Design a protein around this motif. Structure first.
Motif, PDB file in Angstrom:
ATOM      1  N   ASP A 109      30.652  -0.345 -21.675  1.00 23.12           N
ATOM      2  CA  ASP A 109      29.340  -0.501 -22.282  1.00 23.12           C
ATOM      3  C   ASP A 109      28.351   0.506 -21.691  1.00 23.12           C
ATOM      4  O   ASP A 109      28.448   0.870 -20.518  1.00 23.12           O
ATOM      5  CB  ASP A 109      28.827  -1.933 -22.122  1.00 23.12           C
ATOM      6  CG  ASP A 109      28.849  -2.419 -20.694  1.00 23.12           C
ATOM      7  OD1 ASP A 109      29.411  -1.734 -19.817  1.00 23.12           O
ATOM      8  OD2 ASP A 109      28.284  -3.504 -20.450  1.00 23.12           O
ATOM      9  N   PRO A 110      27.386   0.985 -22.492  1.00 24.14           N
ATOM     10  CA  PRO A 110      26.543   2.098 -22.036  1.00 24.14           C
ATOM     11  C   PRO A 110      25.487   1.761 -20.996  1.00 24.14           C
ATOM     12  O   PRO A 110      24.566   2.557 -20.799  1.00 24.14           O
ATOM     13  CB  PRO A 110      25.879   2.580 -23.333  1.00 24.14           C
ATOM     14  CG  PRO A 110      26.780   2.141 -24.412  1.00 24.14           C
ATOM     15  CD  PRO A 110      27.302   0.819 -23.953  1.00 24.14           C
ATOM     16  N   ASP A 111      25.565   0.610 -20.332  1.00 22.18           N
ATOM     17  CA  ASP A 111      24.728   0.367 -19.165  1.00 22.18           C
ATOM     18  C   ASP A 111      25.547   0.197 -17.889  1.00 22.18           C
ATOM     19  O   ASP A 111      25.135  -0.526 -16.979  1.00 22.18           O
ATOM     20  CB  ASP A 111      23.800  -0.830 -19.383  1.00 22.18           C
ATOM     21  CG  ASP A 111      24.540  -2.118 -19.699  1.00 22.18           C
ATOM     22  OD1 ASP A 111      25.765  -2.083 -19.926  1.00 22.18           O
ATOM     23  OD2 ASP A 111      23.879  -3.181 -19.704  1.00 22.18           O
ATOM     24  N   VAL A 112      26.707   0.849 -17.796  1.00 18.78           N
ATOM     25  CA  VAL A 112      27.406   0.871 -16.518  1.00 18.78           C
ATOM     26  C   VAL A 112      27.682   2.314 -16.106  1.00 18.78           C
ATOM     27  O   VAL A 112      27.691   2.635 -14.914  1.00 18.78           O
ATOM     28  CB  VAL A 112      28.686   0.011 -16.558  1.00 18.78           C
ATOM     29  CG1 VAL A 112      29.751   0.591 -17.472  1.00 18.78           C
ATOM     30  CG2 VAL A 112      29.223  -0.200 -15.163  1.00 18.78           C
ATOM     31  N   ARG A 113      27.831   3.214 -17.075  1.00 17.57           N
ATOM     32  CA  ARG A 113      27.793   4.619 -16.702  1.00 17.57           C
ATOM     33  C   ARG A 113      26.359   5.062 -16.518  1.00 17.57           C
ATOM     34  O   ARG A 113      26.016   5.677 -15.506  1.00 17.57           O
ATOM     35  CB  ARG A 113      28.474   5.492 -17.751  1.00 17.57           C
ATOM     36  CG  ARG A 113      28.410   6.962 -17.407  1.00 17.57           C
ATOM     37  CD  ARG A 113      29.228   7.235 -16.168  1.00 17.57           C
ATOM     38  NE  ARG A 113      29.184   8.640 -15.785  1.00 17.57           N
ATOM     39  CZ  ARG A 113      29.978   9.581 -16.284  1.00 17.57           C
ATOM     40  NH1 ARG A 113      30.873   9.283 -17.204  1.00 17.57           N
ATOM     41  NH2 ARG A 113      29.866  10.831 -15.868  1.00 17.57           N
ATOM     42  N   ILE A 114      25.508   4.717 -17.471  1.00 14.95           N
ATOM     43  CA  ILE A 114      24.103   5.070 -17.429  1.00 14.95           C
ATOM     44  C   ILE A 114      23.342   3.796 -17.097  1.00 14.95           C
ATOM     45  O   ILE A 114      22.991   3.020 -17.992  1.00 14.95           O
ATOM     46  CB  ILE A 114      23.686   5.688 -18.773  1.00 14.95           C
ATOM     47  CG1 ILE A 114      24.589   6.883 -19.069  1.00 14.95           C
ATOM     48  CG2 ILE A 114      22.251   6.121 -18.757  1.00 14.95           C
ATOM     49  CD1 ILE A 114      24.405   7.491 -20.426  1.00 14.95           C
ATOM     50  N   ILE A 115      23.121   3.546 -15.809  1.00 10.96           N
ATOM     51  CA  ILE A 115      22.510   2.290 -15.387  1.00 10.96           C
ATOM     52  C   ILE A 115      21.012   2.351 -15.649  1.00 10.96           C
ATOM     53  O   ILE A 115      20.343   3.331 -15.306  1.00 10.96           O
ATOM     54  CB  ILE A 115      22.851   1.970 -13.918  1.00 10.96           C
ATOM     55  CG1 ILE A 115      22.511   3.101 -12.933  1.00 10.96           C
ATOM     56  CG2 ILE A 115      24.321   1.626 -13.799  1.00 10.96           C
ATOM     57  CD1 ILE A 115      21.172   2.953 -12.198  1.00 10.96           C
TER      58      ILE A 115
END
Lengths: 482, 49, 48, 50, 286, 97, 97, 49, 49, 50, 50, 49, 49, 44
Positions: free
Chosen positions: G78-84
């Protein structure tokens, strides 16, 4: 508290082997890429605990190199690896497809056909671990039992199945079809903090082709696809070269292409810097920063266009039926920061990671431990906000994984079919002249290798002139095989 | 953590140095100067599970 | 210098005729009447 | 010999061909689990056959 | 085309792009700092004591180090016993011949709860205490048990750091008059973070290039005529018109960056609070 | 506990004034539109808590005539501030229609 | 102090790729006439065909739908674990046992 | 026309799908099981009954 | 396993515990008992799988 | 690996292209006077904008 | 710079031309017997004529 | 012609125009290299012991 | 000592001879960029002079 | 080539002597057309 464990056990535990300090009194094995070694490497909480880059969207500095595809919250691996069972011993029964292209969609005409393949029962490649280890050192040996081919025959009526077979055996009625991603790969070893490599392939007819796709990927995560067995394949997880899953995609500094070592490309000063497909400008200049990251205007113009023909008529949001999962635009996401000024703020005096303390007597010192220390105020970060007002400066790098850069071999970079007018421009001449490429690239601690697809036509053609024979006249122009 | 970060605030009867023995400082108010000993009286949740 | 006069691009359908034209007319007359249930047409390399 | 200017690879890079031995020489492993010798080692010049 | 604009923005002193705080956030919303507080002449502490040492000196240190040639390495004044290291075994056994430590903060400072507290570092190795001049004012504050006094129990150092609270707003200030911070009843003093707003730009940059204005408008016209091609009335809401034209053309749900367009959209668990109670069908223990 | 703090972080704030309570002896400012006035004012939890009007997907009545777009879970206004750093001095570089 | 061992997911590779020798010219297979034996498939060291069925069905069908048989999953983090994108912490009031 | 295979997979000892443990998971992560130790020739227990 | 596996015991729902002093017995009652290792879930993970 | 015969560059030298970053990586300098990071450093992967 | 994967020569090897100086630079010898300087040494930039 | 480091070759490839390899069109068993030496038996090509 | 230099094939019609010399690396600005950091030697560059 | 060895890194300056000719012409008033090449190393 549950946001904290969402930052420790999800990102902070994924730092590379420079970080994740081993605790005392427990010895670890030598091999450095087992699970017996990656279990005991304890990540520090006091690096990106909850207070890092606070209120920004910034992925940390050693997250440039680790994929999110070794991930234990990988929602594909959440589904695949538990569709088998939660245990060590699994009697699987799975069904592989026929995914080589030229005999996939080929409808087969009546006769009798000897048909073979071979299966890769070594255990590193058949499986996809999440964290990745020497998956055959730990010992995970898959064995095979009895292996078949199910076939579904359409019950076509005998007035027509004996009509159609006498119809698809003419010369002009025969089957002929491409490969999607018609290409040749040429993967190049760019060694371990080499900031740039040159590239040549010499002096071939560039007869008709379109597009160059090129990306970067770690050499720890590639197969030796030529040999059947493969030693040295240390890390078995989320291989980019096969899974279509690229994540060093964004670490090209500057890209340039020169035919004949004399003439640039596109030439004629079409692009603003025509000797230069600059792709990440690491300096201010006079303004070449699309979308608040550091992607330039000369290259966002031909990486928004080449997939979608956006560009000259508005930079509008591309259509959802053209926006796919392995598209460029869906995954291109910029970032920002406000890092503290090391020069202007006269009270700046940095604090090394064992001495930064937030939640001072409310955490563990080194690794997640019990209560120690004392309640006390904080050090890091310097407060970027408000009455405190530390002077700041910003950072503007991005990451766009999952796709490939594309340079369409064209005049106006427009995808206008299979051929290109500048692609078939060389058949109007007869030149057969070479090229050189130099790729200025981000230096890295790991040996890394560079991937290049010359997206060149891959057309097969088959016809069955009798009952049982099948001949497959192939062609690839250029980069042929004869 | 307890309310205030206070586990056992024992009065440690303040004192000021002097050569090879020392006693009887003015401004330390010996019947009150309380700190802890060790760490905070902390108890634990596994709030994820 | 025409793409069409190059024989190995009509022999491979890089550049040449669409699938409605180079096939024999006995096949396309069949192919548009069985595309509802027995779909053939992902096999013939419509050239662009 | 003694570069001292760390711009590296000015030399023309030829593709690595597809077999085992031109990619790395880390401490590899055979298919059941004992470690195989690296390609730097002169151990891997005779066919070790168990 | 587009317009490219460069510049430097201040964002105000009220930016706060995050809820909560980043300074002692896991710490309780109520627990106070280990401060002294001042009498007419006397001092009263409420602090705490990690870092169980072995032998205090006269006025030098605490004897943590143990070398070979009888070298007792002592504690630097501005530097250690450090507030994030302590006992890790839950048998401290304090009260034996070993003695204890800490850093209790002095009363030249203001006072604040531990939540939202901050003091800038003054020496690169970790360096809490601020300087006067090079003397970072840290004295050898001593303490000794009531049971067998004058053999001391706890040397724990004092600081005159610059305490600031970047995000608190001081709910329950007690009834202490002017000029008295770090008082007796002033310990209570809980805090809470400030409300997070977002000083971003505007959606789609509407308002930056002002339309629908009689006069002070802009002109597209050739040099050969200077016959303007823009006529701008007062009632034509052109700033609004390009918004929701992209709804009638493209996706609103996708967050583009170069136009800086992203829909001002609430959460349907906020405007419409579908209240269902909570999942506490079993008890939850410490 | 967690759904209690959900209401107070999100919906028990953003109430219009005469509903928030100025605490004891703090020096709040006087301008209604300064940050430091809407900062220091603290809303009561008991007016809008985890017990009130449960079972009905009700937009609560004083909150009804407030922006839901001043609300800080505004994922296209939250997004653009994440896109432009996290601090005071922001040297932007933008592209405008 | 027992911290948990960290988890990984041993599973089959997505779309079962790598389980059939492709482009290993020599370890290829052949569809051939039973009477004629001739190769109706020859292979090259280049011409990646795992990046050409995987990434092909991305065009025609979709991939975000999960699937049983061929284990055609996604690889979507999901895009909030690479890009926190941190909110700080969601507290504005205490919380306790 | 699709193949199938079948057989036995072994997966190694290092699988562990679930994060955290499933064994006494709600425990405080410092507490010991009730045991003892030899002091010299002698055991003092830390249990609960 | 049931047949081939050697020491397979027939522990059932009353005689089955992890979290032994941490979860209530037979319902959402308040928790009792003492700390003790688990017994029921066979691991299927590790060297003792 | 371990040359020991100091005849150097038997390898085909490709021209250095014209930009900053393929010539040296010494401690450079910006146009007003603060030093810029070398190309060996991973500091120069984000646009430092003052 | 800091290879660490010992696969060596990925670079295109050009033939050594036929003269003395591109083969080795070991401590050579003149035709009567005194040693001549290696090509690494800057001694061999002037015509030493006895 | 008295060569004696001639057995030290391990594998030999050959290509034309960087794309087509030779003998080409799958003449040999392993066509895109000439394995002069194979140090792993596996299926076993160790001809003449 | 030596550097081999190759360019690939083309027609060789109407070219005069050669010119080759040697330049210190600090004495040659990389001309293609606008601004050129690392270029410190302000010492009469023979690349331009 | 063969160059003398030096401690300071030096770069080499092969300069060929291919022609480099320009030709201009203009038909009308506010126009110019420069048709040119250099042979070999042409820009096509």
């Amino acid at each position: 508290n549950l946001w904290r464990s969402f930052l420790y056990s999800n990102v902070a535990l994924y730092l590379p082997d420079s970080y994740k300090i081993t605790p005392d009194n427990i010895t670890l094995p030598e091999n450095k890429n087992t699970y017996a070694y990656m279990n005991g490497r304890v990540a520090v909480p006091s690096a990106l605990d909850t207070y890092v880059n606070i209120g920004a969207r910034w992925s940390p500095d050693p997250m440039d190199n680790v994929n999110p595809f070794n991930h234990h919250r990988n929602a594909g691996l959440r589904y695949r690896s538990m569709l088998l069972g939660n245990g060590r011993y699994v009697p699987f029964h799975i069904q592989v497809p026929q995914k080589f292209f030229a005999i996939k969609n080929l409808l087969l005409l009546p006769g009798s056909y000897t048909y073979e393949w071979n299966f890769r029962k070594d255990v590193n490649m058949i499986l996809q671990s999440s964290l990745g280890n020497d998956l055959r050192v730990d010992g995970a040996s898959v064995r095979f039992d009895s292996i078949n081919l199910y076939a579904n025959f359409f019950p076509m009526a005998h007035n027509t199945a004996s009509t159609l077979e006498a119809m698809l055996r003419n010369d002009t009625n025969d089957q002929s079809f491409n490969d999607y991603l018609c290409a040749a790969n040429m993967l190049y070893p760019i060694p371990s903090n080499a900031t740039s490599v040159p590239i040549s392939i010499p002096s071939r007819n560039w007869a008709a082709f379109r597009g160059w796709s090129f990306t970067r990927l770690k050499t720890k995560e590639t197969p030796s696809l030529g040999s059947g067995f493969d030693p040295y394949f240390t890390y078995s997880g989320s291989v980019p070269y096969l899974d279509g899953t690229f994540y060093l995609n964004h670490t090209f500094k500057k890209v340039s292409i020169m035919f004949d070592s004399s003439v640039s490309w596109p030439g004629n000063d079409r692009l603003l810097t025509p000797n230069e497909f600059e792709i990440k400008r690491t300096v201010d200049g006079e303004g070449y920063n699309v979308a608040q990251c550091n992607m330039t205007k000369d290259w966002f113009l031909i990486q928004m266009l080449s997939h979608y023909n956006i560009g000259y008529q508005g930079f509008y949001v591309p259509e959802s039926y053209k926006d796919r999962m392995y598209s460029f635009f869906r995954n291109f996401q910029p970032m920002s920061r406000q890092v503290v000024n090391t020069t202007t703020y006269k009270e700046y005096q940095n604090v090394t990671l064992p001495f930064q303390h937030n939640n001072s007597g409310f955490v563990g010192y080194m690794g997640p431990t019990m209560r120690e220390g004392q309640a006390y105020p904080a050090n890091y970060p310097y407060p970027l906000i408000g009455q405190t007002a530390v002077p700041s400066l910003t950072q503007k790098k991005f990451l766009c994984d999952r796709t490939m850069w594309r340079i369409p071999f064209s005049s106006n970079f427009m995808s206008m079919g299979a051929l290109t007018d500048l692609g078939q421009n060389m058949l109007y001449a007869n030149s057969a002249h070479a090229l050189d490429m130099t790729f200025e690239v981000d230096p890295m601690d790991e040996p890394t290798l560079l991937y290049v697809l010359f997206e060149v036509f891959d057309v097969v053609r088959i016809h069955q002139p009798h009952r049982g024979v099948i001949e497959a006249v192939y062609l690839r122009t250029p980069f042929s095989a004869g | 953590f307890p309310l205030g970060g206070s586990a056992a605030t024992d009065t440690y009867s303040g004192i000021k140095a002097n050569g090879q023995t020392w006693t009887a400082d003015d401004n330390y108010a010996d019947r009150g100067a309380e700190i802890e000993s060790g760490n905070i009286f902390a108890m634990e949740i596994n709030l994820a599970a | 210098a025409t793409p069409s006069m190059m024989p190995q691009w009509s022999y491979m359908h890089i550049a040449g005729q669409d699938a409605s034209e180079y096939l024999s007319p006995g096949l396309v007359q069949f192919a548009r009447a069985t595309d509802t249930y027995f779909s053939l047409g992902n096999k013939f390399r419509n050239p662009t | 010999v003694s570069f001292k200017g760390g711009v590296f690879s000015p030399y023309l890079t030829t593709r690595l061909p597809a077999w085992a031995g031109v990619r790395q020489n880390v401490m590899g492993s055979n298919v059941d689990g004992r470690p195989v010798a690296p390609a730097n080692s002169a151990t891997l010049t005779y066919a070790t056959v168990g | 085309t587009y317009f490219d604009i460069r510049g430097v923005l201040d964002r105000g002193p009220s930016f706060k792009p995050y809820s909560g705080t980043a300074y002692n956030s896991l710490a309780p919303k109520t627990a106070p700092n280990p401060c002294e507080w001042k009498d007419n002449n006397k001092i009263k502490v409420r602090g705490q004591a990690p870092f169980i040492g072995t032998n205090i000196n006269k006025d030098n240190g605490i004897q943590i180090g143990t070398d070979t040639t009888n070298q007792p390495i002592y504690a630097d004044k501005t530097y250690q016993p450090e507030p994030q290291v302590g006992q890790t075994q839950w048998n401290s056994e304090v009260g034996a011949a070993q003695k204890v430590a800490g850093r209790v903060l002095k009363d030249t400072t203001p006072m604040l709860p531990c939540y939202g507290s901050y003091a800038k570092p003054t020496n690169e190795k970790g360096g809490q205490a601020s300087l006067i001049t090079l003397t970072s004012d840290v004295n050898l504050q001593f303490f000794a048990l009531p049971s067998t006094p004058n053999e001391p129990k706890a040397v724990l150092y004092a600081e005159n750091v610059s305490i600031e609270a970047p995000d608190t707003h001081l709910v329950y200030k007690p009834d202490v008059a002017q000029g008295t911070i770090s008082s007796a009843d002033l310990l209570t003093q809980q805090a809470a973070p400030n409300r997070p707003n977002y000083i971003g730009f505007r959606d789609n940059f509407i308002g930056l290039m002002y339309y629908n204005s009689t006069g002070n408008m802009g002109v597209l016209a050739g040099q050969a005529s200077q016959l303007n091609a823009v006529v701008d009335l007062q009632d034509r809401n052109t700033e609004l018109s390009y918004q929701l034209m992209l709804d009638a053309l493209g996706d609103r749900s996708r967050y583009f960056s170069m136009w800086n367009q992203a829909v001002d959209s609430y959460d349907p668990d906020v405007r419409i609070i579908e209240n269902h109670g909570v999942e506490d069908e079993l008890p939850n223990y410490c």
